[PDB]
Amino acid sequence: IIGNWDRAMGASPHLSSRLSTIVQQHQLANSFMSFSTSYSDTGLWGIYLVTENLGRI
Amino acid sequence: GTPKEEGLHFIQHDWPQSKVLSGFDHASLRRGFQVYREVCSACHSLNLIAWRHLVGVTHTADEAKQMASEVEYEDGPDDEGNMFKRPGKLSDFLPPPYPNVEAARASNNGAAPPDLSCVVRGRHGGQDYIYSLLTGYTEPPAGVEVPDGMNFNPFFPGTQIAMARPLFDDAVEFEDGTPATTAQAAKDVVNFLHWASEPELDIRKKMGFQVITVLTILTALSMWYKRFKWTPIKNRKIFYQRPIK
Amino acid sequence: MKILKSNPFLALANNYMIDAPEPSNISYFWNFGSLLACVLVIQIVIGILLACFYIPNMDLAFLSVERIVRDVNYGFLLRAFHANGASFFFIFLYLHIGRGLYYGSYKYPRTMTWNIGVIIFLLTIITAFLGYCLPANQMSFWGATVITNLLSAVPFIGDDLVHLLWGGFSVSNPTLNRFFSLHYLMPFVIAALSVMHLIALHTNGSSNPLGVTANMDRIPMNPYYLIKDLITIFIFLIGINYMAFYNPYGFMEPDCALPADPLKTPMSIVPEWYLLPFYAILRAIPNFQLGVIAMLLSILVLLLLPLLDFSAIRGNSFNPFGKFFFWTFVADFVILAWIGGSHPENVFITIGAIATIFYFSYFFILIPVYTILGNTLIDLNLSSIKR
Amino acid sequence: MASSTIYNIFFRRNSSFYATIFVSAFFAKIGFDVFTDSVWKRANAGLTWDEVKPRFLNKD
Amino acid sequence: MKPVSLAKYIQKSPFLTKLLLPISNAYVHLSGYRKYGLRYDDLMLEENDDTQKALSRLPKMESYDRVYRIRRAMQLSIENKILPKSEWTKPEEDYHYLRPVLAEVIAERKEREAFDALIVKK
Amino acid sequence: GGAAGGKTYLGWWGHLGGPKQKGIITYSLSPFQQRPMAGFFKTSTQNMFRRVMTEGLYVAIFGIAYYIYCWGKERNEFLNSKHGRH
Amino acid sequence: GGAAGGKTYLGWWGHLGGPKQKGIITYSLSPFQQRPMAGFFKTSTQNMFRRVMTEGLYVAIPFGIAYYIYCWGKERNEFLNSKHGRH
């Protein structure tokens, strides 16, 4: 649902995730990806952001 | 300057109104009101306490109305002008004994009896100074003299006061049967005068306690919450990895 | 972009109250400004409420005040809160000035803020006098008569200014009308000057006790410093409620509950306690014009501070001489207040003269000398460490 | 049960938080009123007008 | 304007230096910036053009060390503590790492402060 | 957008005007994981003891002020007496 | 400064937020070289005449109707409460 995005994507404007819409519209970041790394009895669930638009983090 | 021209320091007492939680002793208030009415209202004036100020404090509505109906007041024009008189009501102030300042000065030699509405708060010492003044008329010491019409009282600034000793033994017969002496009557009238100065003591002291309690609890909670929220800053760890070129 | 950073008014609120970088190690002495703002708001509201029951005239002001006290619903709370808040205002003002003086906050780049604060202090002092002169009791009448007569010290048009201010030939109905009209207006000017104070401060930010640049470490004001000010607010409330509900006439002299008799001169003619040191400075000098000149200079000398500190360090945290001399000056100030309060007797004249001399020496002789000495000692010791 | 249900009911949405705050304030006002009235009444024993009425009024 | 310390005048006479050395040692101990590990040159103001230019002419390692020192001092001041007795700044490390650069910048600025005032005596 | 303002020393987040930083590591913990009022009485007592010990004499020597107050009051009272006018 | 303000439609000098212009030459003179009170009366009279002849009825009709009903109402109200009006 959260999805991935990248500024070099061919169809970047037309993606159907609200976060991608806002980020592409306001040029907030370069790219972001979602991960759900899991382990035997625990795990993680988050995002990974890379940006160069300093001051609007 | 000289203590003779400054007056001897008053004497410290203990009163019910001094306590943190106590209020007023109302039987003493009624006794003081009686003493003021029967010994003081001849010369001093209390033209800031209405008859309705007494119902619930030292009298009931019927008693206050009956007492106020005795005195007489002027009641404006009527029909063809004129200035008539009417019996007293429950919304009129206590009758002053003298019309203006000039008549008061003329009657009592050349001194003006001050108004007693706010005399407890307007004197350096409070109740203590007044009580020590009323019961301090002593024989003059050796070497001093008093001009005619002047009395000796060390507590008065200058040790010369133009007010003959007001209170004497068994001057009034209290309703409850208390043995009326100079000291007891002086204490009761001092209490009544202090009530007349600040008539809202009970309510104010009542709300202050609850306000203080609520504020204390809120302050303690605020300190705890401030201690809680600022933790991620007061407990930081900073490590410096030296940037070797 | 979030709403708070887009809409104009919300951006104005956010840039000053929510998102604003601040030094991360400012002590509890940096909260007094919020207390000042709260006290000013309380004073404005209470005065607006009190103006609905007060008649400004010679023959009706005192009776109106008494009617407020004992007839209007909860009028004692109104009057006591007004008086006690006006008293607490000067305590917090003195603490603010002390904080600004101890840590050397008058140095660049915050000189304009210092000057605006000095102007605000003068306006507040002027506002206090008119406010206390309204009830027309004994001390108000006589103190106003004494103080407004000081305008005759100017060369030329001497007594003409006094007559113009009095609106007659003595303290009467017109001067009370003037004072009531002016006492309503000044607090709004004070609020505008406070807004100017804040907008001048915000361009460079607050200092820190250490005295070094705080650009390396900063935290936003919203979560941290909006909760560190609540404790001070509640403590101030608990302080003022005790006075309002257990000793309302605390700072109030006995001679302030009598009608203004223009024939009986009181034994002592003194102003309220927070103006006592300046009165002592005025009374110290036997001359008349020199007295008012020194009284004005005692408050105008705060503008000469930036060009009197020859110190490489900014503050008194690492200044051994400054810590001693600051508390010495504070003790001298307290002595001046005590001397001004009491009678002008034999020994008190000498004590007040000595205290005034020390007060005017501290700002003009001691500061440059000890700053230079500290700089010289530190430089010498550092230079004589390798060999 | 445990402490999870308490969070779920009261401090989960802002609206429930505010409603709980307001109801608790409404009842705390009455509680403090009762406490201070009791404390004041027990503080003044034998020196109130309603207490001293039978010493003056009845003997008219 | 600017600090006017007169240590150079005192150092001309060895008598005064020998007499005043213990007093200076006691004063530097009393000032107590070493308890936070800071150097004396971190306390000078940097809000004018001269100091802001001088801070840009420092070696990179010196700037990084200064940043670390100031950050550690601020973190210590947050929780109202001081460094233990073993980590205090030793006299060997309390040298002048900023005075020469500032002096050079001031000399350059003073150099220009003359051509404009130049007059022709004829 | 509006205009280019004067020379200041704050900027905003990102461009705060500070120097370039390198090799700094910072840790912390969530406020909901740390126990508040932990190490409070010990640290506060030690800090207060140290502060009293070090900056105590700078304030204590309010010392001569009280003495001059007492001496002045006593002498002024003595001089306004019977034997003071002899 | 920064503060990352919002979005507007004005900007400032240099970047006024308008479409790119090209090939628009503009000439103007100096206020000290030109002559005030030159052709003012003629142009003003022509403009006033044109404005009166153009807008005209737009204001003339409603005000005239309002005045007519005002006069009629005053006359009728005065008549009705008189002697013969009540009858």
Ligand SMILES: COC1=C(OC)C(=O)C(C/C=C(/C)CC/C=C(\C)CC/C=C(\C)CC/C=C(\C)CC/C=C(\C)CC/C=C(\C)CC/C=C(/C)CC/C=C(\C)CC/C=C(\C)CCC=C(C)C)=C(C)C1=O
């Ligand atoms: C980064 O660093 C900094 C920090 O530090 C670290 C900071 O902390 C801060 C942030 C915090 C500050 C210190 C900023 C705040 C300080 C100031 C800006 C100081 C300025 C203070 C003021 C301007 C005071 C303003 C107070 C006012 C206007 C009082 C007026 C009050 C009212 C209108 C409401 C009360 C009602 C009154 C008095 C009337 C009586 C009551 C009635 C019910 C009767 C009236 C009824 C009517 C008339 C009915 C009709 C009403 C109508 C229609 C009119 C509208 C209603 C009205 C009442 C007007 C900053 C900026 C910062 O840089």
Ligand SMILES: CCCCCCCCCCCCCCCC(=O)OC[C@H](COP(=O)([O-])OCC[N+](C)(C)C)OC(=O)CCCCCCCCCCCCCCC
């Ligand atoms: C009576 C005195 C207090 C009276 C009430 C005082 C409080 C008034 C509200 C608090 C102050 C106003 C909110 C300010 C912050 C804000 O704007 O929140 C609006 C949010 C969306 O804001 P956002 O986070 O920036 O997301 C939008 C970003 N886009 C997509 C545009 C790029 O959108 C939302 O989710 C919420 C929108 C609600 C807008 C305010 C409605 C007015 C309040 C209605 C009453 C609420 C119930 C009150 C019960 C007490």
Ligand SMILES: CCCCCCCCCCCCCCCC(=O)OC[C@H](COP(=O)([O-])OCC[N+](C)(C)C)OC(=O)CCCCCCCCCCCCCCC
């Ligand atoms: C002009 C209208 C006034 C203004 C009247 C309305 C404004 C109230 C003034 C204080 C405003 C404080 C704003 C703090 C931000 C906020 O609104 O967050 C709500 C907080 C709890 O926020 P939280 O800590 O993040 O936890 C919520 C967890 N969720 C539910 C999100 C999962 O919950 C709270 O903040 C509760 C605060 C106390 C609310 C009870 C009312 C008390 C204030 C009114 C009475 C006092 C008025 C004083 C005025 C000087």
Ligand SMILES: CCCCCCCCCCCCCCCC(=O)OC[C@H](COP(=O)(O)OCCN)OC(=O)CCCCCCCCCCCCCCC
């Ligand atoms: C005297 C009257 C004062 C007001 C009376 C008390 C008001 C209610 C206080 C009780 C609840 C506090 C909220 C708890 C924390 C919270 O819940 O929220 C936390 C918010 C921060 O938000 P956050 O996202 O970082 O929180 C983390 C994730 N949600 O901190 C606050 O908002 C602090 C609220 C205090 C209100 C301001 C007090 C200071 C006034 C300054 C005056 C400035 C000048 C004004 C001039 C008029």
Ligand code: HEC
């Ligand atoms: C015996 C009838 C009586 C007369 C006559 C009388 N009073 Fe007084 N009197 C006072 C007080 C209080 C003062 C104020 C003393 C002062 O101002 O120092 C005063 C002062 C005076 C003064 C002014 C003295 C001066 O030097 O200015 C006069 C005159 C006076 N009283 C007259 C309390 C009382 C009380 C106690 C309720 C009673 C009874 C009383 N007085 C009864 C009387």
Ligand code: HEM
């Ligand atoms: C910084 C702001 C203010 C200060 C310092 C101040 C100060 C004072 C003081 C000291 C008094 C004397 C009270 C007494 O001696 O009992 C007073 C009285 C008074 N003030 Fe203010 N005041 C301020 C704001 C205001 C405002 C804004 C108003 C009106 C809107 C106002 C109206 C009054 C009135 C009517 C009185 C007379 C009532 C009385 O004395 O009981 N004040 N003021």
Ligand code: HEM
């Ligand atoms: C109504 C009166 C005042 C208001 C509302 C006000 C407001 C503020 C506030 C909120 C602060 C931030 C807290 C702080 O830095 O200490 C501040 C700072 C400051 N104030 Fe005031 N103040 C007032 C009076 C004064 C006065 C009378 C002076 C000087 C005589 C003054 C001089 C300063 C200075 C120099 C600073 C900067 C301190 C620093 O940055 O370290 N202010 N002001």
